[PDB]
């Protein structure tokens, strides 16, 4: 089997092309680059510049006003680890609501950036479901109108793990990002013309094991954008089916919700260790 | 903004003094020293000496008799990490009930030590609620008659994290303890005349985001007393409100309990990493 | 007290012999070697050879076909951590159903290997319950017809922790495995004639604190078989009783289930740190 990370045009997928190839990719690899999805280096420049300017020239008062009282990295500014937790790296997060913006121009640029990412993530997830003939409990659209989280970081840096999202979209700017493909770590360089997609555990779950959730990590001067498309707490699934594809669930009953499985706080990643 | 860790007299707070300053501290820093709360180096000496004597002269049989069958560090003696888990450090824990005491004198000294700590923690938490005009679901006293945990350790030693308590009271004896203040790690030396207070995530939650829960850590021959004031499993709060201040909750419904959020086992700290 | 790890014959236990010694072992140590349980180096050779052959000569296609879409190490092949997650070590897991076998001969050999392990684990757990006069809520057999997990690994390697199983059976092949006995790490060498047993937190819980769940770790060219006997999600227990023996539960009510306590996903180990 080719260990190459494939590339798919969203437009072409939406037209019913390369369905067999798409299915094989999802099953055997669970990751691919996506083009023609409305996201390129162009849309990124604007957001990167404005936020980077903030991480460098924003004062403490300005950062404080956009910092959550709890360091959860859910909304606003965060200094992630004498000195400051910023020494290692800084982060900016946002979602569909309850955001913290430092200025008007920043808000406009990022609200639009977030929207393109959300639209693209929903679109590719929609094709993931169609290619596997998957109809989530409660319908496709209700499943896709969910709880996304966008994190932008600015600098092994990150330990091996898999994501618990439906799908995760990544934009980057030495190749630090590595993913397991064909039983070996493969480089995942930047593609100014595309976004990198990682399938998460929820894709595996909802499709009944038809999609792989690949492990990946970061080796150790770069910025990355990570968009997690996460289901709603009440997303419902079959317990026996989860067991049939690898989930070591401790759930009584025939059906369960995302909340029942993961708990009352979103968990984005999981280390196999 | 001054990055100095302020000091407040409990007596003065209870009299309605420095309310504006207290509010600013809670919001911008989430930590402060507390005086006139009935806890000083005096009350500590007695407890420290008796337990330290145990950690050094107590036999294996004596330690075994006050050691829980599961190494949870909830009650009794614990050797925390050829050799012994004690090599790194030893710990002694207690709560309102189900305690394990090695002797009568030890019991008397520690029951009184625990009580002063619990009274002080409840008292400062009571002022935290009043300063922010917070009325917990079910009332103030029911909220404060909770599930505290006292841990005494004897020796980065501890990774950056924030506490999930309402408030945490610390007594100490090179400044190892560092906390993030104004975007920088600040030393938190010992004050024989006061107790150091850290606001936890529950303070942030119950007050609707009016209190910061500061991150902190320990850099690497000292003993420290840590008292966590923790809510009851049935403490209830508004889901939309939790989201409004940073909590990345995966909870269906308008209201939820501490148990719904954290799970069936108390979790005292959380690393932002 | 002797810090020696005792050995017990399953046959002799089932006949009512050494009951006082067994009780003392469970309470003070929580670990022991077990003989006459139907498991020796003989039964192991067959399974070890066939799987080891796979880890070395099996192609990527063959490994892929027995690899779960999510890297949970619940069923099938797993490469556990330029290179591959296999570099560190490889693993093969199985349970009562939903298994992934690479060949017919492999299936026969391992289905029988798993069965002997499950029978032995249930048998010793049955004696653990009888020696402590324990009658689980819902009866002994319903409690023992549970959710076991068998993991076979092929290479500190593993950090200090205790197991959350009822009991855990280990077969091994320099002594890497160390356990805390009498307040000191003790070697746990291989015994071709016996299986090593570790009591888990569930044994402590169901017996009301009569059984210790010992901490252990691995120091750093060997293979080990680990069989966790895990309760069903609906296993029910008394909340006040759990508190009486060390469990820091955040559970409202008088009774709770394993699922209520641990969550919707099995958790096999826990680090005291
Ligand atoms: C390598 C980056 C995309 C970070 C990542 O994988 C994550 O945040 O889950
Ligand atoms: C620095 C000590 C007070 C330990 C601590 O922060 C904790 O136990 O949460
Ligand atoms: C030392 C081995 C038996 C591994 C282990 O303890 C475990 O998997 O829980
Ligand atoms: Fe990831
Ligand atoms: Fe802390
Ligand atoms: Fe273990």
Distance CA(A200)–CA(A170), nearest Å, equals 13
Distance CA(A147)–CA(B192), nearest Å, equals 48
Distance CA(B158)–CA(C178), nearest Å, equals 24
Using the 8-state DSSP alphabet, how is residue A174 labeled?
Answer: -
Q: A interface toward B at CB cutoff 8 Å? A: 60-61, 63-64, 68-76, 78-86, 98, 147, 149, 232-234, 257-259, 262-266
Pairing status of strand A89-94 against strand A149-154: antiparallel
Mutate to test the interface with C, among B87, B264, B267 (most CBs of C within 10 A): B264
Q: Ligand 6 mean position to B72 CA, how many Å?
A: 15
Domains and CATH numbers, chain C: 1-273 (2.60.120.330)
Contacting chains of B (3 CB pairs or more, <8 Å) are: A, C
Point out which residues pair with C225 in neighbouring strands: C152, C171
Residue with the two structure tokens 């330990």: A159
Q: Is C184 in contact with B84 (Cβ distance < 8 A)?
A: yes
Q: Which tokens sit at B62?
A: 């004596």
Q: CA A266, A269, A273: angle at the middle one, nearest 5?
A: 130
Q: Relative to the CA of A177, which ligand 1 atom is closest?
A: 1
Q: Relative to the CA of B226, which ligand 2 atom is closest?
A: 3
B149 contacts in chain C (CB < 8 Å): 248
Nearest residue of chain B to residue A264 (CA atoms): B261
Q: Is B185 in contact with A82 (Cβ distance < 8 A)?
A: yes
Relative orientation angle of helices B41-57 and B104-131, to the nearest 10 degrees = 140
Contact C32, C59 (CB under 8 A): no
Q: Is B50 helix (H, G, I), strand (E, B) or coil?
A: helix
Taking each continuous run of H as one helix and of E as one strand, the counts in chain B are: 9, 15
- Which segments of chain A are extended strands (E)? 7-9, 31-35, 76-80, 89-94, 149-154, 158-163, 167-171, 177-180, 185-187, 195-199, 216-218, 223-229, 236-238, 255-257, 269-270
Cβ C158 under 6 angstroms from ligand 3 = yes
Q: C interface toward B at CB cutoff 8 Å? A: 1, 27-28, 30, 160, 162, 180, 182-185, 201, 204, 209-213, 215, 243-252, 256, 260-263, 272-273
Using the 8-state DSSP alphabet, how is residue B185 labeled?
Answer: E
Active-site residue identified among B23, B74, B130, B270:
B74
Name the residue of C216, C222, C223, C227 whose CB sits within 8 Å of the most ligand 3 atoms, as the mutation to test its pocket: C216
User: Which residue from B162, B244, B249 is facing A265, i.e. has the nearest CB?
Assistant: B249
Q: Ligand 1 mean position to A180 CA, how many Å?
A: 14
Q: Relative to the CA of B163, which ligand 2 atom is closest?
A: 9
Active-site residue identified among C74, C130, C157, C191:
C74
Cβ A202 under 6 angstroms from ligand 1 = no
Q: Relative to the CA of B218, which ligand 2 atom is closest?
A: 1
Residue with the two structure tokens 């091996």: A160
User: Which residue from C75, C76, C79 is facing A183, i.e. has the nearest CB?
Assistant: C79
Q: Ligand 4 mean position to A227 CA, how many Å?
A: 10
Residue C236 CB neighbour total at 10 angstroms? 16
Q: Ligand 2 mean position to B226 CA, how many Å?
A: 6
Distance CA(A52)–CA(B136), nearest Å, equals 40
Please name the method used to determine this structure: X-ray
C153 contacts in chain A (CB < 8 Å): none
Distance CA(B125)–CA(C105), nearest Å, equals 66
Residue C74 designated active-site: yes
- Positive or negative torsion for Cα A47, A177, B159, B115: positive
Length of chain A: 273
Q: Which tokens sit at B36?
A: 């006139």
Distance CA(A197)–CA(A217), nearest Å, equals 14
Q: Which tokens sit at A202?
A: 């929820």
Distance CA(A181)–CA(A185), nearest Å, equals 6
Cβ C80 under 6 angstroms from ligand 3 = no
Q: How many CA atoms lie within 13 A of C77 on its CB side?
A: 25
Q: Is C273 in contact with B81 (Cβ distance < 8 A)?
A: yes
Alpha carbon distance, N-terminus to C-terminus of chain B: 27
Relative orientation angle of helices A104-131 and A41-57, to the nearest 10 degrees = 140
């Amino acid at each position: 089997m080719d260990t190459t990370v494939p590339t798919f045009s969203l437009a072409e997928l939406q037209q019913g092309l390369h369905q067999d190839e798409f299915r094989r990719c999802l099953r055997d690899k669970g990751l691919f680059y996506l083009t023609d999805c409305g996201l390129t280096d162009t849309e990124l420049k604007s957001a990167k510049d404005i936020v980077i300017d903030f991480f460098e020239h924003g004062s403490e008062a300005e950062k404080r006003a956009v910092t959550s009282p709890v360091p959860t990295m859910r909304r606003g500014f965060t200094g992630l680890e004498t000195g400051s937790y910023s020494d290692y790296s800084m982060c900016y997060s946002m979602g569909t609501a309850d955001n913290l913006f430092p200025s008007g121009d920043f808000e406009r640029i990022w609200t639009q950036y977030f929207d393109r990412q959300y639209t693209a993530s929903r679109a590719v997830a929609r094709e993931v479901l169609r290619a596997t003939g998957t109809e989530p409990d409660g319908g496709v659209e209700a499943f896709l109108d969910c709880e996304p989280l966008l994190r932008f970081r600015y600098f092994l840096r990150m330990a091996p793990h898999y994501d618990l999202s439906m799908v995760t979209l990544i934009q980057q700017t030495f190749v630090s990002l590595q993913a397991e493909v064909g039983g070996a770590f493969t480089d995942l360089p930047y593609r100014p013309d595309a976004v990198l997609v990682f399938c998460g555990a929820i894709a595996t779950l909802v499709t009944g094991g038809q999609v792989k959730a690949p492990r990946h990590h970061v080796a150790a001067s770069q910025t990355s954008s990570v968009f997690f498309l996460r289901p709603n707490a009440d997303f419902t699934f079959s317990v026996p089916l989860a067991r049939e594809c690898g989930f070591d669930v401790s759930l009584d009953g025939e059906t369960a919700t995302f909340q029942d499985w993961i708990g009352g706080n979103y968990v984005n990643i999981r280390r196999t260790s």
